[PDB]
Design a protein around this nucleic acid. Structure first.
Lengths: 79, 94, 116, 136, 50, 178
RNA sequence: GCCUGGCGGCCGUAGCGCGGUGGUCCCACCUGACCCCAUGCCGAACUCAGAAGUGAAACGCCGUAGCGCCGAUGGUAGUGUGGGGUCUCCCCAUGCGAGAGUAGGGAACUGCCAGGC
RNA sequence: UCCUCCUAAAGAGUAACGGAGGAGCACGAAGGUUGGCUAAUCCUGGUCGGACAUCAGGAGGUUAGUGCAAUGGCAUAAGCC
């Protein structure tokens, strides 16, 4: 028969890279599709809707593993 | 008795180990849990004949390095996948 | 386990207050006593504490772990908080309901001057 | 025989054959037919070598088959052009790397095992060797 | 496409309206909601459909 | 009065005096016993609520739980769960009252137990009782409903009773006096 | 110094199992419930008022490696660059270098406040 | 035309008449908030309950569930009231 169909996305991964000086609201990890690979806990709580993680203060990205579940968190720390 | 004459390893790594196997010798390691492990090389044909002797694994062996007798026991043997020869032995201090 | 269920109830508001950087007035309630702790937003050091097991509070009360005891502990913790000079704390239920001794402690802190 | 009862997916990618095999030791039996060289072992070749073994040992002792044909191989029919989808699944192979013990044997004398392994090796495409159980 | 488009008309006397969808097979009653009327700048009742 | 019996007897005199055992918190305690009903896929019945609310509102004025499914998994066409049972778990003083009224109906009059009532055997700690015979009813109409006390009553019991069981108290069926 | 409670840090060298141990200091079960309140019934739970009783359960502490968990050294697989046999796969120089196993470790450590001895 | 996975080479992207599946909706609650709660499965005693209807106990730990495909999620639950 026939089985040749596919969808499209054009980004699916992080943009902030833990040295990245992201200001204001830059999407640190857009189209993660989900709050579980990365959580936002440094600059308050990101993860608005479609779980896009974004900065809330002008500063450097921070990647870290916290919690009892060994979950990965994106933080924003000041320069 | 099972005495093996062994030499210490000047260089470690995959290239050095393949150079040993090209020169018809093979690497080995001795560890005891009380002091630092010692990396040695062995004469492959002699240690092969001691493999073919079936009592190689049960009893206590004697490795001579620099004139020093070390009482060991064969823990595991890394064998070549499709040839009779053998690549690596680890010895636990007995 | 009742303590584990209480921690599961408390955890959502505890992490929400941790993310806001809020100084938490937490309350612990037992059948015998009630405890109040104003804790700095880092969560590691306790700024102000007032307990029913403290003898100065406990000697004035007919029964420890009463609603009157909860009001006395809330008044005491708000008095020591205003003596320390800190204000604008956020109240943590710590898994309990806002009812009875917990509500009485928070109402006494609000009356004595600790604003939420 | 030796086609799997179910598969998660009907067809696979072609892939490439790996470096060296896992399962080089003689584990269950006392003698083994180790592989020296790469190739794909068809289920029909596996069955033919098994029958040669079993009749050579006269259905005595016990024989282990350590490999399984879990990869479907598709072939296009005759006089059809390229494209128009992937072809129909025709037969099943096991990817063999050097050092893979293919068969195992126990309960027989060693020379009878060698004769049975030689008659199986005459049916297999890849070069094989006789191996014996070794303690480590 | 069983759901069909309806209006919600302000009860504050203005011409302002919202639009939404509703299925009359399961919800035949008229939908009433307190919505913001930007002409009046207050939250008022919105009920009437097209 | 059975709560006063539990507080009073078998505990306080002899084992307290001669040879000490550790705790009245360690001796087994009767927790909330329960009763359940098991009606079919019909929803139109009111008889289940009638009997359970009668046994509850002979003293109280409350209603039983109408239970649909704890499991919420159905082999029928509707997976959501139809209301197909009643629950009354007994409670404190009313628990002891219901246990006492069950004893004072079943025990002192030999009516129910013909032969050996224990036929299905396994070990792990279950006592459900289904009489299938109407033992008591509070109204003047003794038996007008379709249900004949087929409901199960669950008592949880480590059925061993070893020391004074095999000493003097077995179970069986000879009413005697002093 | 010891024990207990609360809030953390760190998240299996942190847990589970087995055995022992603690009591109107503290905490748990526990007493009662019209009343502050709640059960689609449930003073189970949530609450409130607390004369007695035991720590039995839970919880805390200690011991035990049985299971989880961590885990080298050496070797192997892979691979960047350059070169070489190649029919579909490898080899050499050099750089990086696992995973699984092995020896072994492991019955957490720590900060603030409060209470009793 | 749109969505999900793989191909796709550990950033994004990436073709074939390549390998598999779905969508052209639904919901005024199936949205918001507050308060509360935790599954699948297995072993047992009892009314047609029989292997699976409903209770009670134990084991287990998310093997469940998500309005609908697949993927990534989810216990502070986004799962249930």
């Amino acid at each position: 028969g026939g089985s040749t169909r596919n969808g499209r996305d054009s980004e699916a991964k992080r943009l902030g890279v833990k040295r990245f000086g992201g200001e204001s609201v830059l999407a640190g990890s857009i189209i993660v599709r989900q709050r579980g690979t990365k959580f936002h806990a440094g600059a308050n709580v990101g993860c608005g809707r479609d779980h896009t993680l974004f900065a809330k203060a002008d500063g450097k990205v921070k990647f870290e593993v916290k919690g009892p579940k060994n979950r990965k968190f994106i933080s924003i720390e000041a320069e | 008795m099972f005495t093996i004459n062994a030499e210490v390893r000047k260089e470690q790594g995959k290239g050095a180990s393949r150079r040993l196997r090209a020169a018809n010798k093979f690497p080995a390691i001795i560890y005891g849990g009380k002091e630092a492990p010692l990396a040695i090389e062995l004469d492959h044909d002699k240690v092969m004949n001691m493999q073919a002797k079936a009592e190689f694994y049960s009893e206590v062996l004697t490795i001579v390095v620099d004139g020093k007798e070390i009482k060991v026991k064969a823990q595991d043997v890394q064998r070549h996948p499709y040839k009779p020869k053998l690549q690596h032995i680890d010895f636990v201090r007995a | 386990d009742k303590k584990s269920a209480r921690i599961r109830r408390a955890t959502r508001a505890r992490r929400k207050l941790q993310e806001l950087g809020a100084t938490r007035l937490v309350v612990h309630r037992t059948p015998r006593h009630i405890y109040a702790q104003v804790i700095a937003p880092n969560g590691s050091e306790v700024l102000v504490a007032a307990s029913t097991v403290e003898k100065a509070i406990a000697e004035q009360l007919k029964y420890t772990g009463n609603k009157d005891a909860a009001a006395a502990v809330g008044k005491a913790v708000a008095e020591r908080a205003l003596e320390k000079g800190i204000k604008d704390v956020s109240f943590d239920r710590s898994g309990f309901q806002y009812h009875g001794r917990v509500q009485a402690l928070a109402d006494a802190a609000r009356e004595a001057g600790l604003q939420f | 025989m030796l086609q799997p009862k179910r598969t998660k997916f009907r067809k696979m990618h072609k892939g490439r054959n790996r470096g060296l095999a896992q399962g080089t030791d003689v584990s269950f039996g006392s003698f083994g037919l180790k592989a020296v060289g790469r190739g794909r072992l068809t289920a029909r070749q596996i069955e033919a070598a098994r029958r040669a073994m079993t009749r050579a040992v006269k259905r005595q002792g016990k024989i282990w088959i350590r490999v399984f044909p879990d990869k479907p191989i598709t072939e296009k029919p005759l006089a059809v052009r390229m494209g128009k989808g992937k072809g129909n699944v025709e037969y099943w192979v096991a990817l063999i790397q050097p050092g893979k013990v293919l068969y195992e044997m126990d309960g027989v004398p060693e020379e009878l095992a060698r004769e049975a392994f030689k008659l199986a090796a005459a049916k297999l495409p890849i070069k094989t060797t006789f191996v014996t159980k070794t303690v480590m | 496409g069983i759901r069909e488009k309806i209006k919600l008309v302000s009860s504050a006397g203005t011409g302002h309206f919202y639009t939404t969808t509703k299925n009359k097979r399961t919800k035949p009653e008229k939908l009433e909601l307190k919505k913001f009327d930007p002409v009046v700048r207050q939250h008022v009742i919105y009920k009437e459909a097209k | 009065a059975k709560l006063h019996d539990y507080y009073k007897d078998e505990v306080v005199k002899k084992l307290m005096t001669e040879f000490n055992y550790n705790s009245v918190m360690q001796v087994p305690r009767v927790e909330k016993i329960t009763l359940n009903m098991g009606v079919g896929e019909a929803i139109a019945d009111k008889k289940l609520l009638d009997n359970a609310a009668a046994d509850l509102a002979a003293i109280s004025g409350q209603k039983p739980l109408i239970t649909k499914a704890r499991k919420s998994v159905a082999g029928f066409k509707i997976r959501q769960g139809y209301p197909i049972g009643c629950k009354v778990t007994l409670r404190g003083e009313r628990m002891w009252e219901f246990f006492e009224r069950l004893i004072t109906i079943a025990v002192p009059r030999i009516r129910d137990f013909r032969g050996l009532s224990a036929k299905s055997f396994d070990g792990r700690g279950n006592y459900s009782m289904g009489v299938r015979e109407q033992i008591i009813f509070p109204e003047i109409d003794y038996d007008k409903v379709d249900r004949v006390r087929g409901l199960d009553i669950t008592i949880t019991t480590t059925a061993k009773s070893d020391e004074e069981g095999r000493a003097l108290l077995a179970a069986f069926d000879f009413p005697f006096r002093k």
